[PDB]
Amino acid sequence: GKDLNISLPLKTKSIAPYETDVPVKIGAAESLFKTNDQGKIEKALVKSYHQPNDTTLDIELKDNIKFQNGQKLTAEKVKSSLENSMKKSDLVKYSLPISSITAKGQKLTIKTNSAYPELVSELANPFMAIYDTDAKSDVNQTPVGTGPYQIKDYKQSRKISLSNFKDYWQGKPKLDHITVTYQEDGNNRVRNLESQKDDLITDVPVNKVQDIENNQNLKVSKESGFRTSLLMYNHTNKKMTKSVREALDHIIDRQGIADHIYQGYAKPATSPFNDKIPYIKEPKLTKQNIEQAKMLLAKDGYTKEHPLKIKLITYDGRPELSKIAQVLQSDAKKANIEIDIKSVDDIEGYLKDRSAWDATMYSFGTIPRGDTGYFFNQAYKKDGAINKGDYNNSNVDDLINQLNHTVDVKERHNISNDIIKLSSRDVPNSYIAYNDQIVAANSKVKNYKVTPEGIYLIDYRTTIE
Numbered sequence: 061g062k063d064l065n066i067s068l069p070l071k072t073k074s075i076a077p078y079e080t081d082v083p084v085k086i087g088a089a090e091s092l093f094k095t096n097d098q099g100k101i102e103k104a105l106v107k108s109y110h111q112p113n114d115t116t117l118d119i120e121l122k123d124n125i126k127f128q129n130g131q132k133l134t135a136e137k138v139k140s141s142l143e144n145s146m147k148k149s150d151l152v153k154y155s156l157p158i159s160s161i162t163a164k165g166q167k168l169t170i171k172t173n174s175a176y177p178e179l180v181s182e183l184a185n186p187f188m189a190i191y192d193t194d195a196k197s198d199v200n201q202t203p204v205g206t207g208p209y210q211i212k213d214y215k216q217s218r219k220i221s222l223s224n225f226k227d228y229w230q231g232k233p234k235l236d237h238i239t240v241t242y243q244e245d246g247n248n249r250v251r252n253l254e255s256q257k258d259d260l261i262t263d264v265p266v267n268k269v270q271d272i273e274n275n276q277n278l279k280v281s282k283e284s285g286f287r288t289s290l291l292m293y294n295h296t297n298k299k300m301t302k303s304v305r306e307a308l309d310h311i312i313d314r315q316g317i318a319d320h321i322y323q324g325y326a327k328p329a330t331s332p333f334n335d336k337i338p339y340i341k342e343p344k345l346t347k348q349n350i351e352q353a354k355m356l357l358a359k360d361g362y363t364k365e366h367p368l369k370i371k372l373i374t375y376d377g378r379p380e381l382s383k384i385a386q387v388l389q390s391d392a393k394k395a396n397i398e399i400d401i402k403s404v405d406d407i408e409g410y411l412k413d414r415s416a417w418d419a420t421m422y423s424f425g426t427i428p429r430g431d432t433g434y435f436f437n438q439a440y441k442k443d444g445a446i447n448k449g450d451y452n453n454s455n456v457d458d459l460i461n462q463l464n465h466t467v468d469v470k471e472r473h474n475i476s477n478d479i480i481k482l483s484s485r486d487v488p489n490s491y492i493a494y495n496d497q498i499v500a501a502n503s504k505v506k507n508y509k510v511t512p513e514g515i516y517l518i519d520y521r522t523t524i525e
């Protein structure tokens with residue numbers, strides 16, 4: 061049958077939709093709302109919604125949607141799914157300040173205590189995908205969604221087997237089966253594609269694009285997106301002072317990284333957000349300056365006889381991150397910083413031990429749904445789900461909290477720019493590059509998604525000629 065083999069980086073433990081975006085990526089689960097190819101929020105599972113006042117969201121769900129096990133998608137099922145996800149995930153919890161949910165038939169009413177203009181947008185987050193909470197199986201193993209492909213088998217951290225859900229609401233899915241295997245090394249993912257072990261791969265190393273373009277049996281897609289690579293500091297280690305972060309920021313050669321590590325498939329970064337976004341007021345671009353870094357390190361007593369030691373974590377999934385780490389190590393030596401690079405296979409798990417790292421290479425989708433609030437809440441607030449280094453500044457918190465209740469879109473842009481300006485002074489993280497989305501496939505594979513948010517991949521139209 062029409063079977064598709066996919067090789068993905070970033071192995072998962074739990075496959076519950078509130079633990080990872082993989083279920084949405086591979087076509088197993090769907091959120092109430094979704095972004096279209098142009099990045100705009102649209103109803104997906106929702107027929108109609110209204111906001112009669114600024115604390116009330118009334119949703120009417122479509123009446124023709126079933127979960128993969130044949131159960132009807134109803135307002136009660138959505139209520140139970142959202143409530144379970146909020147209680148089991150801080151990412152979900154902190155993004156959804158929901159005070160109550162009522163459900164009757166296909167009608168759902170979601171209330172908040174104060175205005176939260178980004179509520180609809182966050183209900184499009186793949187971590188908010190809807191699953192059947194009454195399913196008897198473990199949601200961490202075989203969640204039941206409404207997507208075109210049902211997860212039938214999961215070998216933890218290794219492989220996911222999916223089968224066509226013939227009654228999928230949007231259309232009869234075009235593939236019979238999908239097999240997803242994890243592979244952290246991008247060079248191995250490319251070899252898998254070249255040997256036909258796999259048919260579709262993500263996160264293609266830049267240094268392999270030309271080879272794929274040359275092959276008439278393969279195709280590579282390279283698109284502008286909203287993913288940013290960065291050096292993330294562990295603020296809980298007292299040695300990681302403002303001067304140390306500033307020194308590290310000046311050791312990075314963003315221009316050189318974009319040109320030679322990313323081979324032009326990236327632009328140097330300033331803030332978390334891609335500079336192509338026209339309302340973003342970016343901080344000034346940092347140029348590498350080893351002498352300035354040495355001077356800043358002298359402020360804390362670091363010299364050649366007594367250098368600063370930094371344990372820098374990296375991971376293979378995003379192939380350029382470890383290449384950047386190597387360059388930072390070499391350049392930092394010139395400034396009296398000895399960097400030890402530790403590559404780990406489970407980055408999210410590893411970083412939980414606050415004593416195990418000083419800084420980490422990282423990559424994140426910083427503006428997946430057209431608003432900067434999400435990033436600020438998840439990265440710059442204490443206990444936000446990607447704030448692994450625990451950056452927090454009361455002055456920044458106040459602005460983020462203000463932003464969260466700000467209705468006027470223009471005022472939101474202004475407050476957001478104020479947050480960027482103020483936070484930038486602290487160097488919470490050093491944003492390195494805004495890098496392009498590179499996906500490759502056998503030429504026989506058609507209609508997979510390579511859109512700027514980098515979340516979606518498989519849908520009901522994806523096929524093998």
Ligand SMILES: N[C@@H](Cc1c[nH]c[nH+]1)C(=O)O
Nearest residue numbers: 070378407408422423424
């Ligand atoms: N946010 C990082 C680490 C990660 C692992 N799994 C999911 N995310 C990245 O996407 O590269």
Ligand SMILES: N[C@@H](Cc1c[nH]c[nH+]1)C(=O)O
Nearest residue numbers: 081423424425426445446
């Ligand atoms: N891997 C996705 C989602 C994520 C949540 N936490 C870590 N990663 C990203 O980096 O954008």
Ligand code: NI
Nearest residue numbers: 070423424425
């Ligand atoms: Ni991630």
